[PDB]
Amino acid sequence: MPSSFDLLGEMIGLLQTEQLTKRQDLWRALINQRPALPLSKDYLNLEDAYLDDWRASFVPVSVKDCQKTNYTSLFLYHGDIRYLAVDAIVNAANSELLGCFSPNHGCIDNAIHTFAGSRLRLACQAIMTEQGRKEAIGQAKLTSAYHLPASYIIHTVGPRITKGHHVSPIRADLLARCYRSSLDLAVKAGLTSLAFCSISTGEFGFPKKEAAQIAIKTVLKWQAEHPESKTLTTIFNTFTSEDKALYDTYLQKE
Ligand SMILES: Nc1ncnc2c1ncn2[C@@H]1O[C@H](COP(=O)(O)OP(=O)(O)OC[C@H]2O[C@H](O)[C@H](O)[C@@H]2O)[C@@H](O)[C@H]1O
Ligand SMILES: [Zn+2]
């Protein structure tokens, strides 16, 4: 029943006593760094109220609002993945699948985990314990998207590129795997819209130009090979001005 500002304050108090000036940032740091242990019901209710208020504060971007391109059913969205109302968003995860523990990190995993909320980290832990092993590169796992406007998250782990190294055919195809696996899973889940982030191009150091070429080529080859899934709209979600320019050059050349 507290206000959103007051909710942040109470959540911060619970997390601080259990064991950067904007309150949202302090809260985020604390929840980010928290090992994936069970969570008080009291905390979860505050966080749920907070994320519901967050949701009430914007109108999600719809698939219709995205930019069309030269290629049928491939669309472009330049913005934060947290505001996109699609069937599934693809998270560029790590192999433990537990999200990002680095406070207020600028990666998509952190943004997705923080605003989906804490039930996502707990769900991922249960999934990964059940599995009994870390995730391999280029696979796909489906979870709910919790408080996000998307319905589902598809978690995939892309390849790292050692700094200075170029993209070999193998490493190219490891990135391609993420796209193929995510598309295959979306179809099997009966979804009709999927948003990809620029997997591997942040923390994992995959060069943006090659990554965009791979992403586009892989989705187009998949569409040609999988006629059954022409019902699927794919959105490429760019977040950096460099990615915006690359995707524009490859999908919207006149
Ligand atoms: N809110 C956002 N919406 C859309 N795209 C975003 C957003 N935030 C970042 N991006 C873009 O998302 C893209 C991917 O950058 P990264 O998220 O580093 O993913 P990786 O696969 O390279 O690294 C994964 C590791 O880093 C994490 O800590 C994980 O836990 C793993 O340990 C870039 O284009 C970003 O600009
Ligand atoms: Zn991170």
Numbering used by the authors: 1 to 19, 32 to 266
Quoted from the paper:
In some pathogenic microbes, the response to oxidative stress is controlled by a SirTM/zinc-containing macrodomain (Zn-Macro) pair responsible for establishment and removal of the modification, respectively. Strikingly, however, the “catalytic loop” found in all other MacroD-type enzymes (also termed “loop 1”) is replaced with and extended loop containing the zinc-coordinating Cx(4)HxC motif, here termed the Zn-loop. To gain a closer understanding of the functional role of the 3α-bundle and coordinated Zn2+ ion, we solved structures from the three sub-branches of Zn-Macros namely from S. aureus (SauMacro), Methanobrevibacter oralis (MorMacro), and macrodomain-fused SirTM protein (Mfs1) from Fusarium oxysporum f.sp. cubense race 1 (Foc1Mfs1) in their apo form as well as of S. pyogenes (SpyMacro) and MorMacro bound to ADP-ribose (ADPr). In all structures, the Zn2+ ion is tetrahedrally coordinated with three metal-coordination residues within the Zn-loop, while the fourth coordination-contact is exchangeable and is provided by either ADPr, a water molecule, or a symmetry-related protomer within the crystal.
As before, SpyMacro WT from the extended operon background could remove the ADP-ribosyl modification. ADPr is tightly coordinated within the active site. Within the SpyMacro structure, the adenosine base is coordinated via an Asp92-adenine C6 amino group contact and Phe251 π-stacks with the base. The proximal ribose is rotated out of the active side and the C3′ position makes a conserved contact with Thr213. The C2′ OH moiety is solvent exposed, but the local environment makes it unlikely that a poly-ADPr chain could be accommodated, thus suggesting that Zn-Macros can only interact with terminal ADPr or mono-ADPr moieties. The ADPr diphosphate is primarily coordinated via residues of the—in MacroD-type enzymes—identified diphosphate-binding loop (also termed ‘loop 2’), which is located on the opposite side of the binding cleft relative to the catalytic loop. In SpyMacro, the ribose adopts a furanose ring with a 2′ endo pucker, while the distal ribose in MorMacro is in the linear form. Second, upon ADPr bind, the cavity is closed due to the reorientation of Phe216 (SpyMacro) into the active site to help fix the orientation of the distal ribose within the catalytic centre. We could observe an isostructural water molecule in our structures of SpyMacro and MorMacro in complex with ADPr and Asn-ADPr, respectively, thus suggesting that the Pα phosphate group could act as Lewis base in the reaction.
